[PDB]
Amino acid sequence: QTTSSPVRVGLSVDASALGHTIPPDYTGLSYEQAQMANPNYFSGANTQLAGFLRTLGRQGVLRIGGNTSEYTFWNRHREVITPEAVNNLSEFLDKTGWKLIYGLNLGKGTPENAADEAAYVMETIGADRLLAFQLGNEPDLFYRNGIRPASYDFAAYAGDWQRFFTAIRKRVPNAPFAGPDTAYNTKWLVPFADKFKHDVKFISSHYYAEGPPTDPSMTIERLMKPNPRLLGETAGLKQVEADTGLPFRLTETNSCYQGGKQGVSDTFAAALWAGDLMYQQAAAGSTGINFHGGGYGWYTPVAGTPEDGFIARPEYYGMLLFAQAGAGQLLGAKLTDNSAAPLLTAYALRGTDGRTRIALFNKNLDADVEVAISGVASPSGTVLRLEAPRADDTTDVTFGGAPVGASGSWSPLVQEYVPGHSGQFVLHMRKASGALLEFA
């Protein structure tokens, strides 16, 4: 490609500037526990949904919990989870190769019912595929729903958590746990890590780009800019890790609250946001991510049902770019001369296969860019482009010149070499686009 009047920026790759190593199970999705009320959703029979997950990664994590986990009640025979639903989830995990984070009902359920449900999950799914149980979702927001009274605080929650933990461990001596399954904060997450650091495997935190309802309204323009609250919360998590030894995973995230915002969450801009977010958190030392979704929600990566079929929504294509990059070690990638295109981001990666890759997100809505790439020595680079004709498009999204098809079927159909002369490369990118470069 060539662009009309592009902003000419410099990208310098430094193979000696070592960052974090991306784990092979970094990618992931978060779903409502209420989906378990239908044993045909997370099922070996659901070959469509299993195909979408395999395309997002050979390894990844399925997280089940969410606000419906305070209303879902296990029974060995308001939503009900049966042995049959847990048996079918086991077969779904076998078909996808993914590992499981499983919510237990601390909001409305009993310690003894949680221990009974955990025992059946451990009996059926087993220790290798079960990563963690979580004891409630967003306990700091229990009062907003009246699930607890306004007086409920960290002290109260810690009492609940200990009662559930003790009851579960009696039934399941090897039960693994994560928490506290909420947004970063000083009154809940920091004291949780201090008190329970010997009882959990990792810290589970949540992130939504939209702020409180009294923040300025979320637009595509705002979604593309840096989020200083995200940088702060991520620093907070790094310090918990230094203090307690506990790594962190982002177990529930998406663009906007309450199932997302029409004209923002369901748009190609969400592919750029989600792809960029995956790399920003991996570079910060996060162990992984779980994009919330289900049904036909505005922000869901995968939409549909077993009866009607499943489709890749725009956000899925951001996650697909990450999937095709693969795992490896992050490297130095500094941008210069980039003040008139400030929302361009770039991430360089030494792939586990030994090839250098670069993931670029041109999140500038009104500036095409020309990137002069130094610090890569290769006889040939290829580009796969992440594209839609407008940032607010709800469809027309392609990666490598192709849409995702049925059951997550994808492969690239457009081959493009990156122009190379004097040990350097020059890549044009349209406004609001992304690219994955791979060097021989």
Ligand X SMILES: *[C@@H]1[C@H](O)[C@@H](O)[C@H](OCCNC(=O)C(F)(F)F)[C@@H](C(=O)O)[C@H]1O
Summarize as ranges the residues that interact with ligand X (CB under 6 A): 32, 66-67, 137-138, 252, 257-259, 292-295, 297
CB of 74 to ligand X, least distance (A): 19
CB of 265 to ligand X, least distance (A): 9
CB of 253 to ligand X, least distance (A): 9
Taking the least distance from each CB to ligand X, the nearer of 70 and 116 is 70
299 is in an annotated binding site: yes
CB of 260 to ligand X, least distance (A): 7
Taking the least distance from each CB to ligand X, the nearer of 72 and 324 is 72
Taking the least distance from each CB to ligand X, the nearer of 35 and 96 is 35
Taking the least distance from each CB to ligand X, the nearer of 12 and 67 is 67
Taking the least distance from each CB to ligand X, the nearer of 303 and 330 is 303
HSE of 139 in the Cβ direction (CA atoms, 13 Å)? 28
Taking the least distance from each CB to ligand X, the nearer of 255 and 356 is 255
Taking the least distance from each CB to ligand X, the nearer of 90 and 134 is 134
210 is in an annotated binding site: no
CB of 114 to ligand X, least distance (A): 18
Cα–Cα distance between 49 and 37 in angstroms, integer? 17
CB of 297 to ligand X, least distance (A): 3
Cα–Cα distance between 431 and 37 in angstroms, integer? 44
Q: Residue 340's CB: how many other CB atoms inside 10 A?
A: 11
DSSP one-letter string for 154-167: HHHHHHHHHHHHHH
Taking the least distance from each CB to ligand X, the nearer of 99 and 292 is 292
Cα–Cα distance between 435 and 22 in angstroms, integer? 19
HSE of 431 in the Cβ direction (CA atoms, 13 Å)? 13
207 is in an annotated binding site: no
Buried b (16+ CB within 10 A) or exposed e, 141-152: ebeeeebbeeee
CB of 305 to ligand X, least distance (A): 12
434 is in an annotated binding site: no
**Which amino acid, one-letter code, is at 12?**
S
CB of 137 to ligand X, least distance (A): 5
Asked if 341 and 364 count as a contact pair (C-beta separation under 8 A), the reply is: yes
258 is in an annotated binding site: yes
Cα–Cα distance between 234 and 251 in angstroms, integer? 14
Cα–Cα distance between 424 and 182 in angstroms, integer? 45
Q: For residue 301, say if its preceding peptide bond is cis, omega within 30 degrees of 0.
A: no
137 is in an annotated binding site: yes
81's tokens: 């989870």
Which of 194, 302, 197, 287 minimizes the C-alpha distance to 234? 287
**Residues near 217 by beta carbon (within 8 Å), at least 6 away in sequence:** none
Cα–Cα distance between 431 and 420 in angstroms, integer? 22
185 is in an annotated binding site: no
Q: Which residues are part of a known binding site for beta-D-glucuronate? A: 32, 67, 137-138, 252, 258-259, 299
Q: Which residues are part of a known binding site? A: 32, 67, 137-138, 252, 258-259, 299
